[PDB]
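Retro notes
What went well: the complex prediction finally ran end to end.
Inputs used:
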Amino acid sequence: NISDTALTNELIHLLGHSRHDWMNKLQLIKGNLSLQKYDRVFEMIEEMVIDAKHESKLSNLKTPHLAFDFLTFNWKTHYMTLEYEVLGEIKDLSAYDQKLAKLMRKLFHLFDQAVSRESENHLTVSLQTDHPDRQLILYLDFHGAFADPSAFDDIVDIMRFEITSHECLIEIGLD
Amino acid sequence: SDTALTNELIHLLGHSRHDWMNKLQLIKGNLSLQKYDRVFEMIEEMVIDAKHESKLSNLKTPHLAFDFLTFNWKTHYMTLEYEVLGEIKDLSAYDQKLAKLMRKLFHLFDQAVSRESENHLTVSLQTDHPDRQLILYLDFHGAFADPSAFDIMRFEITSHECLIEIGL
């Protein structure tokens, strides 16, 4: 049974953040509408829909905490900007929400211990449901710069790991 | 809490997301049919509508605010719109009494409006009257089924309007 005292207070806090984003988005739209540039303005809307279609998919993968930690990510960690895609048809990964979530928390932690607070550090997480013989593959594509590049060099089957001076490719596989 | 709260928060953030999606589809539709003026008018309103949502969020009337925000995301037979007329003022005490009343009035409304009509209600909280500290204004437009289901400083139900003024 959910505490409506918690739910109320947190729905207002979170919608507050969703609203600042939606304002910061309309302003971009209006800004380039007011400088006559419809080609860019439709591009912007089409892109904004894209990203909301992935948010919808991450919501409908029945992975409650992974979705949560991912929507609220950018509202609460200034470390790097998350961005995510769900590739393949939606599936019920309810049974993997606790595993995937804790894993992503662990990876974010070791990325925060390692990314450089001076460059535009971005992380894209693309979840794959579409694989012939693995339940999910998570692809992490980082762009940025590191401080402690060493904090990973340590490291579910981690299928691939490439560190360059300004990129990182990790691919986790599941079953 | 943990999973419980979280999946509820995530389903509600998804309602908000549909709303902003629809607002974007509308704007693109008016760019498409080259009607630029209607788009700046639209953007202005979404700016306004977000201002009243902040206003509600910061009146320290947490439960009223929640009900008002989720109204359209729940099963009702009329749309809501709201406005907070005046300066943000700590309606901290009134919160639970206001929320109670607005729920009793929303139920009266769901029993009275024509389920087969596009009913709409606008509620303007006047946190600014000189005389009494708060007036809830209801401008309903739609149609009725048992119109009979209906301090009140006005009440005027006609066939496609119902004006109720409430002061505290």
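What we learned: The beta strands of chain B are 79-85, 120-126, 135-141, 152-157, 162-167.
What to try next: split runs per interface for comparison.
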